[PDB]
């Protein structure tokens, strides 16, 4: 019966919590109470990229630490040369309601998606000398919140229909469908090994998926509101979540529970984006109070504040070499900080 | 900008910089309106001449040297709070209410309260359309305006009943810098884009006066 199956679910939930409490011998702050703090990180705006005339919702560094694509409500993707502050390309969009963008690791493609429920792939390197649409991926029911390239042929998309998908670009069909979330999926982070990825939805939960067989492995629940951002640790054995409850939390897969929470009494605004440094010691998070906060991932203490934006910081990104951090915001400008 | 190829890259960037200017300039003349309301409430038929350009439906029509862009969000059967900030820059909001749908009118009141008091739409004006006015007069003859509002102590006529519903919707407005506009049109008023045009023209004057510091 419905009641009979209800009791079994409660017992499984209680059993999981019993195992969770059994492996919590000491909190991470207890073991990390005897190493020197980072001090006070003071980064400065080294570049200011101008040319967008609306809110910026997404950006992504290329795998060379020099090229980055930015998406804005003006219906255009602009590829920047961050070194020279140059516009390599300007790609008009069929739909101006864009909320995500991705840069292919090979550098030959970019991704775009939003309220049109469609992920669009653009071929940057063409014999005709112009950027053209290579594929239009359809099948999602709700708005597309995030997309991340795996290779030139596979992409993973998160949508507002409580579902993530894996696509074959050449075929244009969903190879795998990921189901289990109760709320809208908002963020999506790919593991360095590409065999796993984690997503955070509006049900105040995060789920770890494997692209090989497409079944949820772990479910994390420590937040009180919508999860807006997620990103893997460089090790690939941990990830960080930013939420609307003005809190950041760090989860570990092998321990399978929360390790550290990042909050302050003076912060009452949700997190829009999260990112790690090259070594994972610094956790950079964008907030709704017009600022980006730098966190000590091992100390849960603020080490610096990035305050140069006149509107909400909606984007974050750390280069592959860790030299620069680029921050996009609703003020139509995005800056590079090092 | 020293080598020969570096100079040609800067010239390409300046050419792209130029084209961004006209595209933004050309988009400035556009008027963006957000259509809201309950399902099957005349939302898609507010203007007879509206022509479409399943997430978002964009409809465009130029009335008098003024391009209007209308966006309908009804296919996004999801959490509105995660994508409603994309329309924070709209000129006004067009809300449609069925005066005939008694059952759906309380849902309209709840929907109307949220949009007025949403943190993004605190200074965004709202044009209110009361549809099905012709059927409302025929409907009140059989079913009176007591089932929807038990607290209605007034005449059972048409004009008096219409004002009570309009007053309730305007009660949800609290900020004094929004200027809700009300209009009644059911199915046959062909001139229904003029009222939107007049309301938008009124809205821009108030915005200009505030920008000029006079208001």
């Amino acid at each position: 019966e419905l009641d009979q199956l209800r009791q079994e679910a409660e017992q499984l939930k209680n059993q999981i919590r019993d195992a969770r409490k059994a492996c919590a011998d000491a909190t991470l702050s207890q073991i990390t109470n005897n190493i020197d703090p980072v001090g006070r990180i003071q980064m400065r705006t080294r570049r200011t990229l101008r040319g967008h005339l609306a809110k910026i919702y997404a950006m992504h560094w290329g795998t060379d630490s020099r090229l980055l694509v930015s998406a804005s409500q003006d219906g255009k993707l602009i590829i920047w040369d961050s070194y020279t502050t140059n516009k390599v390309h300007a790609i008009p969009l069929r739909s101006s309601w864009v909320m995500t963008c991705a840069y292919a690791p090979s550098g030959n493609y970019v991704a775009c998606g939003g309220l049109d429920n469609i992920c669009s792939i653009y071929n940057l390197k063409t014999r005709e000398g112009n950027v053209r649409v290579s594929r239009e991926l359809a099948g999602h029911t709700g708005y597309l919140s995030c997309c991340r390239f795996l290779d030139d042929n596979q992409i993973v998309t998160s949508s507002g229909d409580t579902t993530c998908a894996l696509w074959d670009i050449e075929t244009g069909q969903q190879t795998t469908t990921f189901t289990g979330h109760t709320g809208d999926v908002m963020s999506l982070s790919l593991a360095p090994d590409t065999r796993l990825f984690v997503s955070g939805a509006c049900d105040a939960s995060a789920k770890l998926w494997d692209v090989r067989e497409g079944m949820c492995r772990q479910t994390f629940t420590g937040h009180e509101s919508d999860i807006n951002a997620i990103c893997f640790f460089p090790n690939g054995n941990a990830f960080a979540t930013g939420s609307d409850d003005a809190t950041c939390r760090l989860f570990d897969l092998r321990a399978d529970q929360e390790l550290m929470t990042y909050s302050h009494d003076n912060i009452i605004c949700g997190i829009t984006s999260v990112s790690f440094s090259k070594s994972g010691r610094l956790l950079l998070a964008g907030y709704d109070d017009f600022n980006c906060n730098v966190w000590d991932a091992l100390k849960a203490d603020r080490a610096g504040v990035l305050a140069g934006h006149d509107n909400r910081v909606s984007c974050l990104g750390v280069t592959d070499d860790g030299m620069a951090v680029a921050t996009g915001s609703w003020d139509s400008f995005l800056k590079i900080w090092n | 900008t020293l080598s020969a190829e570096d100079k040609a890259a800067v010239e390409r960037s300046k050419m792209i910089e130029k084209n961004l200017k006209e595209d933004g300039i050309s988009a400035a003349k556009d008027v963006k309106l957000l259509l809201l309301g309950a399902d099957n409430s005349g939302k898609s038929t507010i203007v007879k001449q509206m022509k479409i350009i399943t997430g978002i439906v964009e409809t465009h029509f130029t009335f008098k040297n003024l391009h209007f862009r209308l966006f309908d969000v009804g296919g996004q059967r999801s959490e509105r709070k995660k994508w409603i900030h994309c329309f924070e820059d709209v000129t006004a909001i067009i809300f449609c209410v069925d005066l005939s749908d008694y059952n759906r009118m309380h849902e309209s009141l709840m929907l109307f309260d949220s949009i007025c008091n949403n943190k993004f739409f605190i200074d965004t004006s709202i044009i209110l359309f009361l549809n099905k006015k012709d059927l409302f007069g025929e409907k009140i003859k059989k079913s009176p305006l007591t089932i929807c509002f038990p607290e209605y102590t007034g005449p059972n006529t048409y004009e008096d009943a219409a004002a009570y519903i309009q007053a309730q919707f305007e009660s949800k407005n609290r900020s004094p810098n929004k200027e809700i506009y009300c209009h009644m049109t059911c199915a046959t008023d062909t001139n229904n884009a003029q009222v939107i045009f007049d309301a938008v023209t009124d809205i821009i004057i108030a915005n200009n006066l505030r920008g000029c510091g006079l208001y």
Partner: single-chain antibody
Amino acid sequence: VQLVESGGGLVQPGGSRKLSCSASGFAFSSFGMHWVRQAPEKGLEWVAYISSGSGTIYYADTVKGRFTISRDDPKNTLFLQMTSLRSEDTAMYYCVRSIYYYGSSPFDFWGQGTTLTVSSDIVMTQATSSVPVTPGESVSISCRSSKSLLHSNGNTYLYWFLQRPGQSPQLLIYRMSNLASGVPDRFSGSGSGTAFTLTISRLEAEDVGVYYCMQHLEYPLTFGAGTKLEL
């Protein structure tokens, strides 16, 4: 992608002639355009350059004041107005497309030009002229430069072109080390400042011809004498 040249023929000395090239298959509004000569028994020679948007225009020292370069983007055509023709202007004129951004491949496409009968600068040196090779051996082609082509931005500007008999030259390597689209991976280029080489591993047919080294560090653009491989 197709560039077709028109004009040329028997022109008496002191006359005028207009050469036109029609572009089809690509976007003729984002590509810089070039003119390159080739004397009947000599190497390539740069003539003129017009940028996208007709902003920057350059000429060689031997054609300045006599040659004019212009384009009409809506008509997808490039022009070269030549006045006061001399006996030294008798050559085959090639139209070359070129795009310029981060990671571009300039001088990617050439068009089969039209012959014409009329009857400091960086010095590029290719001492080797004729080299006999076998179908399967590995050969190296060397080029020399008077100046150091390495720039302060880490980009050194050397170009390698192959001109098979009865064909227009095609790009093999751009910027001393970069392979062009459609070029087999056996071609490889390497070198340093004022010293360059091009390696062709596992030489076979269709690799015979004249190889030219060209510098894009600054205008005017200078070519080499040409290294000819013979089977």
